[PDB]
Amino acid sequence: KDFDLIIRNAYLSEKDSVYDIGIVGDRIIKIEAKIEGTVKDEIDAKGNLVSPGFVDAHTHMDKSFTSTGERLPKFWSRPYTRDAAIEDGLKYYKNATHEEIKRHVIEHAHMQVLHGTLYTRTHVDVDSVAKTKAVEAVLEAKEELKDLIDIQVVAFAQSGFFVDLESESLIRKSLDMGCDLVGGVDPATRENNVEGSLDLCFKLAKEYDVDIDYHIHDIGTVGVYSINRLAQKTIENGYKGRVTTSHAWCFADAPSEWLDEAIPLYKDSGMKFVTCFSSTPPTMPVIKLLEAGINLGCASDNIRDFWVPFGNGDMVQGALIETQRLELKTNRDLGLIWKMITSEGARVLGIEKNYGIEVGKKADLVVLNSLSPQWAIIDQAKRLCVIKNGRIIVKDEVIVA
């Protein structure tokens, strides 16, 4: 047989036309309006959109689904407060067993896969309370999930390198255990040492030759300042394109003049950003950043826990949420949001070379029940089929093998 798998009549948005997709093994090897040749299995997209696997560029798989179990979501029957949320996190990581954490990660992964997400980057809490317990469970689950989804693990110094002085050693162990990236939190309001926390993070990064993904929530000018120091140090340490800043809420409230003068520095350092649809500020300059050529991905962030009660791990649902938060309507704008949940996310993860519906690339695809990116966002229709490494793993809202 010429092909292991063929998807007939697949509308490809990047080419704006219907085609057949020829797959052998884990790669796409042919794309034509009508491909001749024998094949083992066939799927009829019936002219509907077929796209590459969605990318959820920022998750917390280890603590997900912790709000579930009761008539009402736990942790939310009281006004939201940063302290009560930080406490809930300490309790959880203290009493949670290795098997508890692993099952949550697996629940999360299955939910993502069912919605077409085949790539994701999760952050794992690393402090003197969670130790490497959470790290061990995540890496274990990651292995058990390699045939369903690709997971990047960030050793996340959640309490701050200068607040929990045990963080640095625990991060080395986590990186030694195999974590793919390292990251800290608010160098300013959390660490109270911008130069120190950033320099240390880069030190650890270089020791294990891993990339960086920083949580920067600080609003206004202090947030932009923190990001500018990070971008500048990125160039200094020869780390162009190896650094991601998550959230960057500060771009929504800092004077636009501050973002305008920093964009050249972000492009020169190849800084990557990720905005989570569970918190993207309405005034966040999303379209502006994309039009400027800045790499901006999208993500679920927390899912049903003490930080965010929401969550279905559905990037298509997230896209609709972004259009409402940002008040977007045109086909071009929805088209940009679709890029954000696909190719932009791929670039954030650094897998763009192998990402995309094109000859020679990975056979990781999603067959939707909608005519186009715009209609899929509007329709919110269920995925009809999900394919990873040339194998069908989801068929009609159910995980096959």
Residues with active-site annotation: 247
- Phi then psi for residue 274, to 5 deg, are -140, 130
Long-range CB pairs of 196-203 (<8 Å, 24+ gap) are: 196/161, 196/162, 197/160, 197/161, 197/162, 198/229, 198/230, 198/233, 199/233, 200/161, 200/168, 201/157, 201/161, 202/233, 202/237, 202/239
How remote is the C-alpha of 275 from its chain's centroid?
9
* Closest-CA residue to 63 (of 156, 173, 1, 128): 156
301 is in an annotated binding site: yes
Helix then strand count (H, E) for the chain reads 13, 16
110 is in an annotated binding site: no
58 is in an annotated binding site: yes
Pairing between strand 3-12 and 17-24?
A: antiparallel
Length, in residues, of the chain: 401
Q: What is the dihedral of CA 77, 83, 87, 93, to 10 degrees?
A: 110
Residue 169 makes CB contacts below 8 A (sequence gap 6+) with none
d(CA 246, CA 222): 15
Please, which residues bridge with residue 181 across strands? 154, 211
Looking at 11-95, list the stretches that DSSP marks H as alpha helix, in order from N- to C-terminal side. 82-95
Locate breaks in the chain with C to N over 2.5 A; list the residue preceding each: none
User: How many C-beta atoms surround the C-beta of residue 32 within 10 A?
Assistant: 11
Per DSSP, the three-state class of 181 is strand
For the chain, the straight-line distance linking the first and the last C-alpha, in angstroms and rounded, comes to: 23
115 is in an annotated binding site: no
d(CA 7, CA 392): 11
Annotated binding site for Zn(2+): 58, 60, 215, 301
List binding-site positions.
Answer: 58, 60, 215, 301
